Every structure is written in structure tokens, then in C-alpha cells.
Amino acid sequence: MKNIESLFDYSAGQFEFIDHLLTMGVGVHFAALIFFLVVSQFVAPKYRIATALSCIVMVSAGLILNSQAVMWTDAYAYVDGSYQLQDLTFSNGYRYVNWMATIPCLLLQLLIVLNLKGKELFSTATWLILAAWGMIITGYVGQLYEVDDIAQLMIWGAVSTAFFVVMNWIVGTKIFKNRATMLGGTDSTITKVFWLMMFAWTLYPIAYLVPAFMNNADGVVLRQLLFTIADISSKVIYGLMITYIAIQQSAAAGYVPAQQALGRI
């Protein structure tokens, strides 16, 4: 049960573009990691964990993107005018394993800026993480068959989509029922984060389906391109909005370092 990446030889332009996409993603996440670390001091204690979760996400994704880059250059060699598969192996499956950690972190930092606490926070986080883990795990099993069994990729993806929809319903319901509690005008900002999340996370099932409608070397490139757009949107851009909401609410709650931080800009 191979992946479609192992099926093709690659032109130098295709190979280097994919490598440059992954290495670019590493640099963006580690550059954002520094930003999230420095602005941590400008967030009130109640919200500071949300910015720390951005730091964990940046290193988690950055390590897996660097991992994918070197595996790409390990597994292929330029022979007779094209990059051909060598002794080693490349696989998008390590992305799925990493999602088991990064997705709960992304969801947790949203619940924190929604001002959920105590029993409701733990309760809502447990249902969301369980739904997300069911989405990822059924998706992982599905892509094992992206070459061998296209019908199984479809059926496991339908199961995965059911968890995805239920997960989004919980997220959206909590957002619209707790919007009134949010400070500094961030009741307007949080609805924008929900829509950004809808857009960015939907890119992943689209990349999952690439083997069904573009099973060639250019579809390998398009999938990595979609992953890159989705990774930056769902982690970096999303994290900046979460951090903005965290600081804005900190300032409205009387945190002086937050108020000063916004004043200078």
C-alpha cells in the first residue's frame, strides 16, 4: 500500500519546487515562533497559555516540515535527467501523526480566548479532541489506500468528514453563544476567526482527494502546495488573530503591558 509520491519520477523543477515549499514553510513557522514568544509578555495571565500554544504549534509543524524536507532529499536521486526513488521512503503519513498533537492545540487556544473556564472548558475540549482524533485516525487509514483502493479512500473519508462536521458544529455553537462575553470589540473579531478556520481546514480534505482526480506528478505538487497554503492559514495567520484577540482582551481587562503594547502601534 504505497503513496502516490512513490509512483513517479520528478523533473528537477518539480522536485526543487516541492523542496522549496517545505523549506519555506519551516522558515515561516520558526519566524512566527519568535514573534509569539516575544509578545507573550504583553498578554494577561488568563490568556497567556493561548500564545504559548502557538509556540508549541510552530515548533511541532516546523519540525515535521523539516522532517519532510530531508526525507524528500534522502529518498530521491537525480539519475539520467530526473529524480528517481532510491532506497529510502517518503510519506505524508507523518503529517497525520503530527495532527494528533497540533489540532488539539489549535482548538484549545480558541476555547481560551472565548473565556470558557472550568467544567465547560474541560468538557468542551474533551469532545472536540475526541472528534478531531476520530477525524484524523479514520483519515490516516484512508490514505493508506490512495493507490491500492480508491473506494476505501472514499469511504474512510466519508467517515472522517462526519467527525469534521460535528466538530465544526461544536466550535461554531460555542463561538456564537459566548460572543457576548468577549471584550475590546473582539466579539466581532472572533466570527472572522471561525470563517478563516472553515476555509483553511477544508483545504486538507481537498488535498486528501488529490489522488482521486489528479493521479500524476503534478498532483503531487498541487497537494504539497495546498498543504502549504493550509498550514500557513490554519496555524500562522490563525495564531496571529488569536494572539491579537488575546492582547485586545488583556488591555480591556486592565493589563498594563497589553495596553502599552497596543498604544505604541
Ligand X SMILES: *C/C=C(C)/C=C/C=C(C)/C=C/C1=C(C)CCCC1(C)C
Residues that bind ligand X (CB under 6 A): 99, 102-103, 106, 135-136, 139, 157, 160-161, 164, 201, 204-205, 208, 231, 234-235
Instruction: For ligand CCCCCCCCCC, give the closer residue by CB, 11 or 73.
Output: 73
Euclidean distance between CA atoms 178 and 117, whole angstroms: 12
Euclidean distance between CA atoms 168 and 106, whole angstroms: 13
Instruction: For ligand CCCCCC, give the closer residue by CB, 56 or 100.
Output: 100
Q: Where are the beta strands (DSSP E) in the chain?
A: 76-79, 82-85
Q: 139 near 152, Cβ under 8 Å?
A: no
Binding mask of the shown chain, residues 13 to 52, with x at each position contacting Br ion by CB under 5 A: -------------------------------xxx------
Min dist. Cβ of residue 254 to ligand CCCCCCCCCC (A):
28
Instruction: For ligand X, give the closer residue by CB, 42 or 204.
Output: 204
Cell numbers representing residue 196 in the block: 478563516
Under 8 Å CB-to-CB from 118, ≥6 apart: which residues?
none
Binding positions for ligand CCCCCCCCCC, 226-245, rule CB under 6 A:
none
User: Interface with ligand CCCCCCCCCC includes 170 (CB under 6 A)?
Assistant: yes
Three-state DSSP class for residue 10: strand
Under 8 Å CB-to-CB from 227, ≥6 apart: which residues?
95, 203, 204, 207
In the list 78, 94, 176, 199, the residue contacting ligand CCCCCCCCCC (rule: CB under 6 A) is 176
| Residue 243 contact partner, candidates ligand CCCCCCCCCC, Br ion, ligand CCCCCC, none, CB within 5 to 8 A by sort of partner | ligand CCCCCC
Min dist. Cβ of residue 179 to ligand CCCCCC (A):
20
Q: Where are the beta strands (DSSP E) in 188-252?
A: none
User: Interface with ligand CCCCCCCCCC includes 70 (CB under 6 A)?
Assistant: no
Amino acid at 208: Y
N-term to C-term CA, the chain: 54
Min dist. Cβ of residue 139 to ligand X (A):
2
Instruction: For Br ion, give the closer residue by CB, 102 or 228.
Output: 102
Euclidean distance between CA atoms 170 and 16, whole angstroms: 41
Q: 198 near 147, Cβ under 8 Å?
A: no
Min dist. Cβ of residue 128 to ligand X (A):
12
Min dist. Cβ of residue 134 to ligand CCCCCCCCCC (A):
11
CA dihedral (128, 129, 130, 135) positive or negative: positive
Strand partners, 85: 76
Q: Which residue has the cell 472548558?
A: 121
Q: Which residues bind ligand CCCCCCCCCC (CB under 6 A)?
A: 23, 26-27, 30-31, 34, 120, 123-124, 127, 165, 168-170, 172-173, 176
Q: Which residues bind ligand CCCCCC (CB under 6 A)?
A: 39, 91, 93-94, 97, 158, 161-162, 165, 237, 240, 243-244, 247, 261
